[PDB]
Amino acid sequence: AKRTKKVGIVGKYGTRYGASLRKMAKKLEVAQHSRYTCSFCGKEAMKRKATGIWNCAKCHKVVAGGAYVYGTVTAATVRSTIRRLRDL
Amino acid sequence: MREKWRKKRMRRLKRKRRAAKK
Amino acid sequence: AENINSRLSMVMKTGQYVLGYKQTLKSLLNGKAKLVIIANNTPPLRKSEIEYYAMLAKTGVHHYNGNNIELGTACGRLFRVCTLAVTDAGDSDIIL
Amino acid sequence: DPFSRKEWYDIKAPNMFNTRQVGKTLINRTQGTKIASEGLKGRVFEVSLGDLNNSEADFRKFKLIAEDVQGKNVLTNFHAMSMTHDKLCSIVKKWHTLIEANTAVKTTDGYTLRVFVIAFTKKSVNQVKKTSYTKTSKIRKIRSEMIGCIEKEVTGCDLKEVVSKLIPDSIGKDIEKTCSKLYPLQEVYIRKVKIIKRPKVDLGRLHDLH
Amino acid sequence: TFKRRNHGRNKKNRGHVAFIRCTNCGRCCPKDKAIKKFVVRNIVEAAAVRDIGDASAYTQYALPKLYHKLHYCIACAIHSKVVRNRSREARRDRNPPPR
Amino acid sequence: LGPQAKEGELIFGVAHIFASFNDTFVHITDISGRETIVRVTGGMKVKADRDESSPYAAMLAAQDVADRCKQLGINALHIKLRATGGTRTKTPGPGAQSALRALARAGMKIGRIEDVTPIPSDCTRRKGGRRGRRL
Amino acid sequence: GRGAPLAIIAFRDPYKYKTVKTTVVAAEGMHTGQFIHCGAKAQIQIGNIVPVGTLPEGTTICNVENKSGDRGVIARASGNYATVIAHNPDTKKTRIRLPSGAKKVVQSVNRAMIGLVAGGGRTDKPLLKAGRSYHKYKAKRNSWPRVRGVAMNPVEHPHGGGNHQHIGHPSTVRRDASAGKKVGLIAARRTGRIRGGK
RNA sequence: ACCGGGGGCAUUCGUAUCAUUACGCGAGAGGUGAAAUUCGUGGACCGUAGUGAGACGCCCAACAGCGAAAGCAUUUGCCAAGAAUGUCUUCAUUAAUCAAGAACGAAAGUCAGAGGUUCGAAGGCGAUUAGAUACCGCCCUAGUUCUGACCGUAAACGAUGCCAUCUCGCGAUUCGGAGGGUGCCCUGCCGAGGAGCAUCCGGAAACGAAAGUCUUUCGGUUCCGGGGGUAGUAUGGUUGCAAAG
RNA sequence: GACAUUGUGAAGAGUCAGACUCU
């Protein structure tokens, strides 16, 4: 059964630090504790080791990514720009 | 700009009523 | 592109195939692998090994336009396939 | 009198134009570290092809940039070309589709020129229908054809030859005669041409040009 | 009461039409609704064409023209008399008036 | 003072005539446009601000400029008509025609006349509100 | 003490039988087993270390060399980067944009790593607890907790003292103030909330 | 050689606005009904050539097109989707409308991060006025722009729900097709749109080829109204960070 | 700010009568 209506993972903080701060922390906590699909082996086994470091449980590759997300929008855009310049 | 201002007046009154009831 | 998916579906429905690296290597060694389809995210060393085996066996290698997830989906499986070998095209024109 | 310090120089257009005398400019006479020649080098003058070649195509304008000064002569070279606002406004008509194109094309000398071309749909001889529109796919094809024709015409030659071709606007008529296979085009002109990238000044080539 | 069958605009088969800024007042008016006029005039007034011609530096010089597409909102157009109020019957007349 | 005339050659300056609805500039430069021979504005000739753009002010400025040009040896003028442009009115003000005719009457030869009002491919938002100037 | 991960990279010594290991802040996307090419002829790829003169305008770089040979000094915090604004071949120089918005001119031979620094977005999660800040500064240095000057006595701070907790004097102090007086907004050009761009 | 400002993501170009650099000028410039606030000899405004930022895509542009609506317009590349038309292709009733339920949904507004050119609520001045917390002018803050989330309201209008069918004439218009002639023309040519003026009947009328085929009422179906206010208010419920729905 | 450390060349202006001063 759904134990918490809206607080979710941030329920560890109880009634502290303010609703807005807890809401802002919820997104990043979920992102940093989620599993991501590894671009190398293709399996959803990428997990955060430390801030910026992501380990693949299967292929054992260590990637430098975001603090709380596997990849960042700015990094994606930079990669796209480099690829486009390579193509043309 | 005649009934729209009545709406604005009523909204102000409702805001005051909310503040008072709170 | 869109044609290879249809040919692969026809091969799965009617043809004969082996899904996976080890079976692909065995089929290449014993010379019944008509074609070898290989995903785009396969490890580079494995890619080179498959290509070397194919060059030895005089068989075609097709670099699928997708990762192992998409290759498995094309094969119609709910798991990931990073390599496969078609040994009998069946009622399909995959080889040509 | 503040005008007692000014010396008068004569602008000299390059040899693509018949009338090599453009006009008279002026500048403060050399004083201290300010040299009149160095002050003049870099100026831009707008002239009309009516004043350069005396052809009927008066509406076309040429910008000439001063790169060297000998004596009292300011030798200029092509810097940019543009049509006249009155001509463009007269050209634009209602009930006609306007096709605009622009392309960066490289000369054999080291220049990159951005050429802007404008064209309009033409009414046939025996046409009753008021409007002269066409399918947007046909517009796309016509634009691509114009770009390709510009590339073929310019690429392979150098700045002198391109300026010679612009003087009568041979490219415009070539477009009007080739691209009409899809929809008969009318009133095609090279609306503008500007210099994106240019090579380092070559005084020997400029002298040959003068 | 509905004054006009077209509701004062020229909008059919369309949901939204981008607006223009009136040449005089600057007010925003839908392009279909705003009254447009294309004015082509001699660059020099009729009273000075002769003076400019006699002062011309060329044997034969064609005097250019000014082309202006003016958009007026309804209020400024009526005030400047670009358009006038019409009778109930004459309102339906759509042919441009004689020039 | 001035250039050397080859016994009847037309020495050409360029007169920029910026005729707005608040003032009128007649500004003479060389062909390059980077050197100014002389310039006069209607506000220099009239006292009240309401008539800085009047045809009388425009013609007075044009007469003064023609006198100075004839003094310096310039005898022909390439005209460059201009309005406020940009997001503002595209129509030349009421001083443009007066200045042009005044130059012609003063006796400068008139070369090529062109309108150089700045026209945008598209503009920033205009000055007034969405309801315009209500006065 | 650093918010950006470090990359241990192994190179072969050209002059002897030995391998040399290098420590540098990783660019986002760099992974173990990757090959990083460093030099004037290296291509435009993420993680490569190349002179800034060979990059096109708008290229995103990190670990930029302030002076040729200083081994990377600019844009080293997590998620930060500089941009290649312009070039000047005649003087052999390049204009770049720093993370702070400043524009700086460097020699075209200055090296930089292509890409942005890994670990971006760190300063978006609130440090909800004071213990989090305690642990944060425990790994960096002794700069926390911070006691307000007005809460002190006049013997330890220019703001201290008074029957009310108030500064009493303008907080904006001049640049050349003495060591014990330079507290507050130092050489402040302006104060208050910034309304507009700046 | 389909059609389309339908959608999304990158990308190219364009002048203009502002700022600023270089050079010249010389005292006004700006703005108004008239002025003033304001800018200007530290040389403004005006010229010519650059540079930078952000915004916006003029003219073409239309009783033109596309989209469920809101809405949609610089070039090119890529992605998925679609209408009409053609069809002696396939399935064979699979359909219409829909409580509850769900997606989208202008502008303003809220939250976070970037940007901050222009314009500009609030604010401050100069005017006008009996006053002017306004209209007019000047300087501007939020905002206007992008990214990711909220709100779910507009005269969100055709003030006309959707599906099917019948009733008139004319000539134009967008798309596709058929047949002829030389991209254009012709066929009282065929469908699908979007309209216009000859219009039976209808309507209190204005007017409507639908708002007609209704006391000769009755094709199917959803929502809504019951003299004007109190009042979209109070209270209760529910959604929302708030504003509020 | 001045003097010393402080050397070697160009261009401009100003002082002089080949020098000095500045930029």
Curated annotation (Swiss-Prot), chain D:
Gene Ontology terms: cellular component: cytosol; cytosolic small ribosomal subunit
Domain of life: Eukaryota
Keyword set, alphabetical order: Cytoplasm, Ribonucleoprotein, Ribosomal protein
Annotated localization: Cytoplasm
A GO molecular-function descriptor: structural constituent of ribosome
Gene Ontology biological process terms in this record: translation
Family statement: Belongs to the eukaryotic ribosomal protein eS1 family.
Quaternary state and interactors: Component of the small ribosomal subunit. Mature ribosomes consist of a small (40S) and a large (60S) subunit. The 40S subunit contains about 33 different proteins and 1 molecule of RNA (18S). The 60S subunit contains about 49 different proteins and 3 molecules of RNA (28S, 5.8S and 5S).
Name used for this protein in its record: Small ribosomal subunit protein eS1
Source organism (scientific name): Caenorhabditis elegans
Span of the entire protein shown here: 21 to 230 of 257
Swiss-Prot record, chain E:
Main localization of the protein described in the UniProt heading: cytoplasm
Gene: rps-26
GO cellular component: cytoplasmic side of rough endoplasmic reticulum membrane; cytosolic small ribosomal subunit; ribosome
Protein origin, superkingdom: Eukaryota
Cell compartment(s), UniProt: Cytoplasm, Cytosol; Cytoplasm; Rough endoplasmic reticulum
Molecular function terms from GO: mRNA binding; structural constituent of ribosome
Organism: Caenorhabditis elegans
Quaternary context: Component of the 40S small ribosomal subunit.
Family: Belongs to the eukaryotic ribosomal protein eS26 family.
Full protein segment contained here: 2 to 100 of 117
GO biological process entries: cytoplasmic translation; determination of adult lifespan
Keywords per UniProt: Cytoplasm, Endoplasmic reticulum, Ribonucleoprotein, Ribosomal protein
Chain intervals with Basic and acidic residues compositional bias: 86-96
The protein, known as: Small ribosomal subunit protein eS26
Calcium in keyword set: no
Swiss-Prot record, chain F:
Pfam families: Ribosomal_S11 (PF00411)
One MF annotation (Gene Ontology) recorded for this entry: structural constituent of ribosome
Quaternary structure and partners: Component of the small ribosomal subunit. Part of the small subunit (SSU) processome, composed of more than 70 proteins and the RNA chaperone small nucleolar RNA (snoRNA) U3.
Biological processes annotated in GO: ribosomal small subunit assembly; ribosomal small subunit biogenesis; translation
Keywords from the UniProt entry: Cytoplasm, Nucleus, Ribonucleoprotein, Ribosomal protein
Cross-referenced SUPFAM superfamilies: Translational machinery components
Keyword Nucleus included in the entry's annotation: yes
Membership in a protein family: Belongs to the universal ribosomal protein uS11 family.
Annotated protein name in UniProt: Small ribosomal subunit protein uS11
Naturally occurring in which organism (per UniProt): Caenorhabditis elegans
Upper classification of the organism: Eukaryota, Metazoa, Ecdysozoa, Nematoda, Chromadorea
Gene it is expressed from: rps-14
GO CC annotation, single: nucleolus
Swiss-Prot record, chain G:
One Gene Ontology cellular component: cytosolic large ribosomal subunit
Domain of life: Eukaryota
Keyword annotations of the record: Cytoplasm, Ribonucleoprotein, Ribosomal protein, RNA-binding, rRNA-binding
UniProt region (Disordered), positions on chain: 156-178
Location within or outside the cell: Cytoplasm
GO annotation terms (biological process): cytoplasmic translation
Family affiliation: Belongs to the universal ribosomal protein uL2 family.
Protein name listed in UniProt: Large ribosomal subunit protein uL2
Organism in which the protein naturally occurs: Caenorhabditis elegans
Gene responsible for this protein: rpl-8
Parent-record interval covered: 53 to 250 of 260
